[PDB]
Amino acid sequence: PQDLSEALKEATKEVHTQAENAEFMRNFQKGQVTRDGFKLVMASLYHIYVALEEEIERNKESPVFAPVYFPEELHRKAALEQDLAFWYGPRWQEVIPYTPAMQRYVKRLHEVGRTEPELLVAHAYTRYLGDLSGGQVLKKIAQKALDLPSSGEGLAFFTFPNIASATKFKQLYESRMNSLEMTPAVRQRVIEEAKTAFLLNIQLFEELQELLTH
Ligand code: HEM
């Protein structure tokens, strides 16, 4: 494939379907999701985005990332902080779980962000773009199966307020990725890192499913 974005999308088709097939994600799609299962996914997201956005801020000016740096449009941490306060309460920071599978994901993120900056774009792509184009469908489901009250909170994560049009921003971000110059070596590694990203989510889904079936 010519474009890195077109290359990524095609190289991760397999793992993505694999992601959709995961037991946890299947039940989620089959409208089957519990408050406890949803809390774990939000807790996970908070840990993942904290680490990811921590590393993006460290490589904000680097030529290997600057092109896809859109902090106001994409930051999710603040939104998740708001959400976890609703799901876990005022003391959420003390009680939210931080599991081994979440730590594995968080660890690879810090590693790439500290010793392989040129691969960070692979994680920002997988997370941000994935949650943006598939966000609505994923939220639509959850909010029905959750039948939560109407306190006006708990799902801020699924809404990117600083993005007027998801499609127009998607194409813009892709454009910026395709503008990134890299050796075929690096490019191949970025492609790999994206596949790796999907595997870190899949094993995470496996673990969460395990924790909820005792
Ligand atoms: C379990 C089922 C999931 C559903 C139902 C779902 C749904 C969606 C939808 C509706 C799209 C739109 C098609 C497109 O953008 O090309 C999409 C794209 C994508 N998803 Fe998923 N997704 C799931 C899980 C995940 C996971 C675990 C990740 C990884 C964090 C992920 C990463 C992506 C990426 C990166 C794209 C955009 C690729 C591109 O077009 O360049 N998705 N997803």
Where residue 198 sits, what CATH number does that domain have?
1.20.910.10
User: Ligand 1, closest atom to CA 21?
Assistant: 1
Q: 26: which residues sit within 8 A by CB, 6+ positions away?
A: 20
Please give the resolution of this entry in Å, rounded to 1 decimal: 2.2
Structure tokens at 95: 């009680």
Q: How far apart are CA 131 and CA 33, in angstroms?
A: 18
User: In Å, how far from its chain's centre is CA 51?
Assistant: 11
Residue with tokens 């994600």: 25
Query: Which residue type is seen at 18?
Result: Q
Q: What is the 3-state secondary structure (H, E, C) of 67-118?
A: HHCCHHHHCCHHHHHHHHHHHHCCCHHHHCCCCHHHHHHHHHHHHHHHHCHH
Q: How far apart are CA 36 and CA 211, in angstroms?
A: 10
Judge if the beta carbon of residue 16 lies within 6 A of ligand 1: yes
**Which residue range(s) make up the domain with 199?**
1-214
Structure tokens at 121: 């774009």
Domains in the chain, number: 1
Tell the residue nearest (CA) to atom 40 of ligand 1. 9
Q: How far apart are CA 105 and CA 204, in angstroms?
A: 8
CA dihedral 123, 127, 130, 132 (to 10 degrees): -130
The alpha-helical segments, DSSP class H, found in the chain are 4-11, 13-21, 23-29, 35-58, 71-74, 77-88, 92-95, 100-115, 120-124, 130-133, 135-146, 166-178, 184-211
CA proximity to 88, closest of 134, 45, 50? 45
Please name the method used to determine this structure.
X-ray
To test ligand 1's pocket by mutation, which of 16, 29, 139 has the most ligand atoms within 8 angstroms of CB?
Answer: 16
- Ligand 1 centroid to Cα of residue 126, in Å, is 8
Q: 65: which residues sit within 8 A by CB, 6+ positions away?
A: 56, 59, 117, 120, 121, 124
Judge residue 110's burial from the number of C-beta atoms within 10 Å of its C-beta, 0-12 exposed, 13-18 middle, 19 or more buried: middle
Tell the residue nearest (CA) to atom 6 of ligand 1. 134
- Ligand 1 centroid to Cα of residue 90, in Å, is 32
Tell the residue nearest (CA) to atom 34 of ligand 1. 130
- Strand, coil or helix: what is 213? coil
